[PDB]
Design an enzyme around this catalytic site. Structure first.
Site, mmCIF file in Angstrom:
data_model
loop_
_atom_site.group_PDB
_atom_site.id
_atom_site.type_symbol
_atom_site.label_atom_id
_atom_site.label_comp_id
_atom_site.label_asym_id
_atom_site.label_seq_id
_atom_site.Cartn_x
_atom_site.Cartn_y
_atom_site.Cartn_z
ATOM 1 N N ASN A 1 64.509 123.309 85.052
ATOM 2 C CA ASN A 1 65.662 123.307 84.156
ATOM 3 C C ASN A 1 66.750 124.274 84.617
ATOM 4 O OD1 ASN A 1 64.556 121.476 81.933
ATOM 5 N ND2 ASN A 1 63.028 123.127 81.890
ATOM 6 N N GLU B 1 56.482 100.944 98.857
ATOM 7 C CA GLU B 1 57.063 101.075 100.192
ATOM 8 C C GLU B 1 57.290 102.534 100.563
ATOM 9 O OE1 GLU B 1 60.113 97.428 100.806
ATOM 10 O OE2 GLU B 1 59.284 98.446 102.556
HETATM 11 N N1 LIG Z 1 64.557 120.240 81.533
HETATM 12 C C1 LIG Z 1 64.247 120.059 80.250
HETATM 13 N N2 LIG Z 1 63.165 120.728 79.732
HETATM 14 C C2 LIG Z 1 62.827 120.573 78.435
HETATM 15 C C3 LIG Z 1 63.545 119.748 77.592
HETATM 16 N N3 LIG Z 1 62.965 119.805 76.371
HETATM 17 C C4 LIG Z 1 61.903 120.644 76.432
HETATM 18 N N4 LIG Z 1 61.824 121.134 77.709
HETATM 19 C C5 LIG Z 1 60.836 122.048 78.300
HETATM 20 O O1 LIG Z 1 59.710 122.145 77.468
HETATM 21 C C6 LIG Z 1 59.119 123.411 77.635
HETATM 22 C C7 LIG Z 1 58.400 123.784 76.347
HETATM 23 O O2 LIG Z 1 57.234 122.998 76.229
HETATM 24 P P1 LIG Z 1 57.246 121.522 75.587
HETATM 25 O O3 LIG Z 1 56.932 120.478 76.630
HETATM 26 O O4 LIG Z 1 58.582 121.257 74.941
HETATM 27 O O5 LIG Z 1 56.141 121.625 74.431
HETATM 28 P P2 LIG Z 1 55.273 120.382 73.919
HETATM 29 O O6 LIG Z 1 54.794 119.521 75.050
HETATM 30 O O7 LIG Z 1 56.025 119.559 72.903
HETATM 31 O O8 LIG Z 1 54.022 121.193 73.289
HETATM 32 P P3 LIG Z 1 54.175 122.196 72.008
HETATM 33 O O9 LIG Z 1 54.708 123.569 72.356
HETATM 34 O O10 LIG Z 1 52.786 122.361 71.399
HETATM 35 O O11 LIG Z 1 55.095 121.533 70.982
HETATM 36 C C8 LIG Z 1 60.250 124.356 78.006
HETATM 37 O O12 LIG Z 1 59.851 125.202 79.058
HETATM 38 C C9 LIG Z 1 61.369 123.458 78.488
HETATM 39 O O13 LIG Z 1 61.611 123.695 79.854
HETATM 40 C C10 LIG Z 1 64.639 119.065 78.100
HETATM 41 O O14 LIG Z 1 65.291 118.328 77.362
HETATM 42 N N5 LIG Z 1 64.987 119.224 79.430
#
Ligand SMILES: Nc1nc2c(ncn2[C@@H]2O[C@H](COP(=O)(O)OP(=O)(O)OP(=O)(O)O)[C@@H](O)[C@H]2O)c(=O)[nH]1
Ligand SMILES: Nc1nc2c(ncn2[C@@H]2O[C@H](COP(=O)(O)OP(=O)(O)O)[C@@H](O)[C@H]2O)c(=O)[nH]1
Ligand SMILES: [Mg+2]
Lengths: 218, 53, 181, 36, 436, 440
Positions: F206, F254
């Site tokens: 990110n 491919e």
């Molecule tokens: N690049 C990017 N990263 C995102 C986005 N939304 C959430 N994240 C990433 O998600 C991470 C936080 O963990 P999540 O995957 O959101 O959490 P989860 O899988 O829903 O699990 P829980 O914490 O239990 O709710 C952060 O480090 C962010 O980098 C997004 O829209 N773009």
């Protein structure tokens, strides 16, 4: 210099100071204990004789018949004494009355936890080594005892978690001072080992709840 | 809650009295009873002993 | 190294008796410690490496990171004391395909998985003192398709006591083995 | 020398993308010849 | 479907909870009659988290009110929003707690713990799934301390896989209100450290300091301190009630902020706190929020965060704001205040954002901070306790009610055990060779 | 006869998939109710929407997507938003309790009672598909459900479908940036399964997208949606050869035999070349010769690692729009003589270029501008080895005192599952070091 979370630290080479370095790993000041007070009085039935093969404490009373509920907590509170003709009396009294004498340790066990915490809480290395050695002797000296100590693991093991990272780092040079077991990391790991060996099947989760870095056998 | 499709975790008001229909008509009836309740509560049209079944 | 050595029936590459046991051995220590200790079981010196993280503290067989040793002898013997903890080791093997392949055994593994560079099989230990009899030639013949020519390094990790890591040609059973091994 | 724009960004820039955080447009393409 | 059962104990806890219900009822647009006529779209969405819907179109809170004195429940009833609660959940004794932990715990708590346990059984079984419980109290009074923690212990034994939320008002260092509060605090903390998963320490002195220096209030009554507490006790549940670009519920913060199973005592805070005239001349940005979030003046507990290292910091934001701004603000705050953070944890800040801001505020944030600064509050309580207990000051109101002398000296032992671990984790470095 | 199944797990995956599916709907004539207009039409055929959509008799298009999370809080806005009539309501799978940033919870305790429904829906979506070769999953490497439930889902699908290809699109945690505390544990644990079950696992941070939106785009203080739109453009670039006819079309299988040399070295980077704003795009001719160089810039990579501390293995460069094969021929020949872009001695070819004819589409209310030519670069380099040594450092910083471990022991997972995965990442680092040596 700076102070903390202010605009002082918002600068361009703002040097921030640091925390006040709280009271861990430092020797706490001592306090007079009940052992010296009761000993200068003279109620203890002990006398020091200097044998040729080392100093041996002479008992002028049958050691089998003694109020352990009054004497064993008094000797355990004497571990906090660093002055030389008192620490021998406390250590050797604990060792002799734990070894000579059985099936009386068990009702005394709930009363000797506070002196054990008092001896351990003084952050001096020699007293910690001595109380760890006598705890290792205590958990093995009788039956039915090790799993009587397991509710009190929350009052012994908190300071055992402090000094598990104290060994010599001499990679090839042998640590010569092995006979005098003065290093505390191995002594703590053997004390936890003896707490797992004797203490039943509930001891592991209590040791994990206290010492998180612990590795179990069996 | 009006434009909610099928399996939907939100709180639809007055929904645990709808009886024997699907999700969509259940939501329609629930929100209709809800709006009826609010409008009869605030605006004083009905006389005494006439605003509830 | 070890290219001009005779490479007889056995080749000691570590020993706890001597001036500098870890001369050719690298020593990384992080949240751990390494020291020499008289054992109360065999009544002699052992090495002693351990730490909280098994992977951070280890010893590698050649000192230089790019230098590799060449040992013809197929077998591998390790007198290691079991402490009921997390102990791993790892070898690197040359073949007729002239690529470098690595075999790693860990105390916490339960599956035997095969990869083009790694092969992570489990390993179980006994109560006290024992020797892990390894066969590099058969482990290259069975798990992989190639043969064995040289081994390039061995790497001993934490939570173990080391004495006399050595290679051999044939599994000396108990009696033809000399008393010093 | 620089017979391209790619080499101007690529070789002589001191920017470490793995290390440098939140740099603007000008702190990427700074060269060694600027310092000395 | 993740719902929380709310409880309030004692004369302080009842006022705190009443202000809390006043806050979140206006958050969701609920009238004092219990009826919804708010304006926002998202208000009636997750109202099943805290409320129940009755026949006829009402919204009743999931509140169980426990007391030992009957004259403090009608004060709550006769409040602005006291008419929304169910009368069946109003459990109350007839003989007062007398500022005794003994009467709150042993011999006047034992006959009313059954009725409140049946009421909380009835409330926490109509749900489809349950997330946890909330309890608001203070560690200084009699029924705020002896009854609430007994209730926590008796609820933990039935719901061991659910979260528990305790929002305690620990007695202040130089502000004294009762004579006997060190005894109550020492008896209460030793079992508030083994029976709940998240605990918030709020001092009345720090709240007064905020109301004097930050808010510039001339005469702060007891309503304003409860409003301050409710402004940060409802910010940790806004991820459950409103959608956000990065959500974090109660258990997410419980996992992230607690490194080891006992250090779950936190320091709350509110970011956009401003005076009555300085509100209008103010620019509200995330770098503006962070300075008022992290400074020592805005701490709701009287422990200076500069006196120790931060373990883990939470910062739940409310408002339609960017993510790189919050990201770079926390990165800068950690990066150049590097000596005040634990160095064996790489990142110590958890960031959460919500899209629905508080009413009248276009951007807000709440602070949850686990610091080793809290070790001085426990040592202060132990010092104020040992002077009374050394000469056996007021023990005949407790031991004559029936206790043993060892029941008071074990509370100090558990207090010291709590202090030593915070000291150790303050002094612990990434390598384990530098402290010796 | 070509399709793909998309499984968006986690809040990050679902929020990425929102932008992805709005992009795919705009790529065709599909209104967000799922029906093509009869007032006007675009120049499309029946071979375009077959990859991502399914056709009913009445004229409704349904995505080949499953939206699954253990939370409601990200899925009901899909059920109540503008794209609420597009999805079949059974695909939007919603749990009850949270993962709480635990690999343990989403792998053992809560994901085990929901996996039998999402697997059945995946099965029902994969029997309506004539061809094979899909399964494009999207998750983040930091959360609880996106790292726990995705690992179990790949574990089940590997034995349920056998070969296929589990395309995996990670959001890997940034070097100096993380929005959680227990992210290294989750990332190591989900890498332990992605390293053996995903066939080529895509990597995106990110922080680097924040930098790209900072400098290339001129926007200040970006949000998550701007990141998701660029990620969606990258994913739409991959499947551009599966829906639009080009000069050098590339199937999904491919470039798997072209990019991935060894069974573990399958973590490629990404680069999108003409990412410029509307006030800047119209003032320069973005010819092939300079958008090719925009792919190899050290600052345009969306993973925080300089390619200059590594040697390239292969590059899959997928052009689209006003592109001619001699232009990309001269562009690749320009790069191969520069002595900074180092290649390994065992790959003398080093490149793989595909040309499409369909330009990238714009999103009304977006940030990018309509460019005629766009490049998506897929670099497989040794430079990603430095991004995992930092994960090793972050894991050994906390595991060495066993911080936060007891929250993971509490749900099913034994203590050595951390060391079991750390030894695998160390083996991966040694493999990356071994493959990067020259040949004497
Ligand atoms: N690049 C990017 N990263 C995102 C986005 N939304 C959430 N994240 C990433 O998600 C991470 C936080 O963990 P999540 O995957 O959101 O959490 P989860 O899988 O829903 O699990 P829980 O914490 O239990 O709710 C952060 O480090 C962010 O980098 C997004 O829209 N773009
Ligand atoms: N924040 C706040 N604190 C209060 C209020 N009223 C009393 N307190 C505090 O509560 C403490 C007394 O606790 P108490 O009500 O006796 O607890 P109980 O005996 O269990 O009911 C005092 O130290 C006060 O500082 C209030 O309205 N707001
Ligand atoms: Mg989530």
């Amino acid at each position: 210099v700076s102070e903390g979370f202010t605009v002082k630290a918002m600068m361009k080479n703002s040097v921030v100071r640091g925390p006040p370095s709280a009271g861990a790993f430092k020797e706490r000041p001592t306090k007079p204990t009940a052992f010296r007070k009761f000993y200068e009085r003279g109620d203890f039935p002990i006398a020091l004789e200097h044998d040729s093969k080392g100093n041996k404490i002479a008992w002028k009373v049958e050691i089998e018949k003694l109020d352990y509920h009054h004497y064993l907590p008094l000797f355990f509170d004497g571990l906090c004494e660093m002055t030389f003709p008192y620490e021998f009396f406390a250590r050797q009294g604990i060792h002799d009355m734990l070894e000579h004498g059985g099936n009386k340790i068990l009702p005394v066990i709930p009363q000797l936890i506070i002196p054990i915490k008092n001896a351990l809480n003084l952050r001096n290395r020699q007293v910690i080594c001595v109380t760890l050695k006598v705890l290792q002797h205590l958990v093995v000296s009788a039956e039915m005892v090790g799993e009587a100590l397991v509710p009190y693991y929350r009052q012994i093991l908190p300071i055992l978690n402090i000094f598990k990272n104290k060994n010599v780092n001499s990679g090839d040079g042998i640590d010569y001072s092995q006979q005098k077991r003065e290093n505390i990391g191995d002594l703590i790991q053997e004390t936890l080992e003896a707490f797992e060996r004797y203490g039943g099947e509930d001891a592991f989760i209590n040791i994990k709840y206290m010492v998180p870095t612990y590795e179990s056998c069996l | 809650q009006r434009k909610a499709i099928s399996g939907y975790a939100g709180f639809v008001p007055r929904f645990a009295w709808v009886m024997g229909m699907n999700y969509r008509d259940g939501v329609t009836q629930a929100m209709d009873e809800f709006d009826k309740s609010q409008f009869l509560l605030r605006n004083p049209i009905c006389a005494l002993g006439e605003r509830l079944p | 190294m070890f290219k001009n050595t005779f490479q007889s029936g056995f080749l000691s590459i570590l020993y706890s008796i001597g001036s500098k046991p870890l001369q050719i051995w690298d020593k990384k220590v992080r949240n751990g410690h390494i020291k020499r200790i008289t054992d109360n079981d065999i009544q002699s010196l052992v090495l002693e490496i351990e730490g909280t993280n098994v992977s951070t503290t280890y010893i590698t067989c050649p000192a230089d990171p790019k230098k590799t040793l060449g040992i013809k002898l197929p077998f591998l013997v390790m007198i290691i004391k079991n402490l009921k903890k997390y102990f791993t080791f790892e070898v690197q093997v040359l073949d007729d395909k002239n690529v470098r392949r690595r075999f790693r055994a860990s105390n916490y593994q339960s599956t035997t998985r095969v990869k083009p560079f790694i092969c992570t099989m489990p390993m179980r230990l006994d109560d006290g003192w024992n020797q892990i009899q390894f066969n590099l030639s058969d482990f290259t013949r069975r798990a992989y398709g190639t043969n064995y020519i040289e081994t390039l390094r061995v790497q001993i990790h934490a939570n173990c006591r080391i004495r006399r890591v050595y290679f051999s040609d044939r599994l000396y059973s108990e009696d033809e083995l000399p008393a010093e091994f | 020398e620089i017979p391209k724009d790619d080499l101007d960004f690529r070789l002589a820039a001191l920017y470490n993308h793995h290390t440098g955080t939140f740099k603007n447009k000008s702190e990427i393409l700074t060269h060694q010849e600027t310092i000395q | 479907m993740r719902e929380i059962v709310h409880l309030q104990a004692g004369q302080c806890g009842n006022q705190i909870g009443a202000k809390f219900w006043e806050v979140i009822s206006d958050e969701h647009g609920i009238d004092p009659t219990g009826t919804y006529h708010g304006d926002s779209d998202l208000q009636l969405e997750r109202i099943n988290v805290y409320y129940n819907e009755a026949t006829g179109g009402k919204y009743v809170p999931r509140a169980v009110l426990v007391d030992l004195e009957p004259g403090t429940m009608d004060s709550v009833r006769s409040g602005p929003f006291g008419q929304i609660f169910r009368p069946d959940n109003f459990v109350f004794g007839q003989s007062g707690a007398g500022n005794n932990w003994a009467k709150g715990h042993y011999t006047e708590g034992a006959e009313l713990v059954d009725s409140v346990l049946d009421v909380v059984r009835k409330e926490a079984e109509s749900c489809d799934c349950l997330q946890g419980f909330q309890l608001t109290h203070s560690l200084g009074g009699g029924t705020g301390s002896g009854m609430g923690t007994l209730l926590i212990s008796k609820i933990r034994e039935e719901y061991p896989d659910r979260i528990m939320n305790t929002f305690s008002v620990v007695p202040s260092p130089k502000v004294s209100d009762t004579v006997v509060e060190p005894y109550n605090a020492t008896l209460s903390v030793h079992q508030l450290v083994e029976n709940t998963d998240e605990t918030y320490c709020i001092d009345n002195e720090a709240l007064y300091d905020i109301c004097f220096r930050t808010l510039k209030l001339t005469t702060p009554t007891y309503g304003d301190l409860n409003h301050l507490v409710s402004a940060t006790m409802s910010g940790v549940t806004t991820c459950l009630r409103f959608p956000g670009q990065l959500n974090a519920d109660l258990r997410k913060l419980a996992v992230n902020m607690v490194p080891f199973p006992r250090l779950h005592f936190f320091m709350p805070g509110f970011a956009p706190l401003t005076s009555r005239g300085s509100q209008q001349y103010r620019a509200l940005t995330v770098p503006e929020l962070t300075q008022q979030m992290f400074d020592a003046k805005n701490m709701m507990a009287a422990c200076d965060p500069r006196h120790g290292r931060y373990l883990t910091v939470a910062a739940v934001f409310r408002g339609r704001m960017s993510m790189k701004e919050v990201d770079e603000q926390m990165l800068n705050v950690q990066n150049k205040n590097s000596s005040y953070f634990v160095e064996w944890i790489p990142n110590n800040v958890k960031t959460a954002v919500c899209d629905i801001p508080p009413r009248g505020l276009k951007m807000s944030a709440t602070f949850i901070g686990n610091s080793t600064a809290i070790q001085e509050l426990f040592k202060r309580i132990s010092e104020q306790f040992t002077a009374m207990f050394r000469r056996k000051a007021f023990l005949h109101w407790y031991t004559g009610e029936g206790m043993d002398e060892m029941e008071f000296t074990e509370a100090e032992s558990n207090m010291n055990d709590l202090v030593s671990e915070y000291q150790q984790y303050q002094d612990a470095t990434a390598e384990e060779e530098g402290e010796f | 006869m070509r399709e793909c199944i998309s499984i968006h797990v986690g809040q990050a995956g679902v929020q990425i998939g929102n932008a992805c599916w709005e992009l795919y709907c705009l790529e065709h004539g599909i209104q967000p109710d799922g029906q093509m207009p009869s007032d006007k039409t675009i120049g499309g055929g029946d071979d375009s929407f077959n990859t991502f959509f399914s056709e009913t008799g009445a004229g409704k298009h349904v995505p080949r997507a499953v939206f699954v999370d253990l939370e409601p809080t990200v899925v009901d806005e899909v059920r109540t938003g503008t794209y609420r009539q597009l999805f079949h309501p059974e695909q939007l799978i919603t749990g009850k309790e949270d993962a709480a940033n635990n690999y343990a919870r989403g792998h053992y305790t809560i994901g085990k009672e929901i996996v039998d429904l999402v697997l059945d829906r995946i099965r029902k979506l994969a029997d309506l598909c004539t061809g094979l070769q899909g399964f494009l999953i999207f998750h983040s490497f930091g959360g609880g459900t996106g790292s726990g439930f995705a690992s179990l889902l790949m574990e089940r699908l590997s034995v349920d479908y056998g070969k296929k290809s589990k395309l995996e699109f990670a959001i890997y945690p940034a070097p100096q940036v993380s929005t959680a505390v227990v992210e290294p544990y989750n990332s190591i644990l989900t890498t332990h399964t992605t390293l053996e079950h995903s066939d080529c696992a895509f990597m995106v941070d990110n922080e680097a997208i924040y930098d790209i939106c900072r400098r290339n785009l001129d926007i200040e203080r970006p949000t998550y949606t701007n990141l998701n739109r660029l990620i969606g453009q990258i994913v739409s670039s991959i499947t551009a050869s599966l829906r639009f006819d080009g000069a050098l079309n590339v199937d999904l299988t491919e470039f798997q035999t072209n990019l991935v040399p060894y069974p573990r070295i399958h973590f490629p980077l990404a680069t999108y070349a003409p990412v410029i704003s509307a006030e800047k795009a119209y003032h320069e001719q973005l010819s092939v010769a300079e958008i090719t160089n925009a792919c190899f810039e050290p600052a345009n990579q969306m993973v925080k690692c300089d390619p200059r501390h590594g040697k390239y293995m292969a590059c899959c460069m997928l052009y689209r729009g006003d592109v001619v094969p001699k232009d990309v021929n001269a562009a690749i020949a320009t790069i191969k003589t520069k002595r900074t872009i180092q290649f390994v001695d065992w790959c003398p070819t080093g490149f793989k270029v595909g040309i499409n004819y369909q330009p990238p589409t714009v999103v009304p209310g977006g940030d990018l501008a309509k460019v005629q030519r766009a490049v998506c670069m897929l670099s497989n380099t040794t430079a990603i080895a430095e991004a995992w040594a930092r994960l090793d450092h972050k894991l050994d910083l906390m595991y060495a005192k066993r911080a936060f471990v007891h929250w993971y022991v509490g749900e099913g997972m034994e203590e050595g599952e951390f060391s079991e995965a750390r030894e695998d990442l160390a083996a991966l680092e040694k493999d990356y070091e071994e493959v990067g040596v020259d040949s004497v």
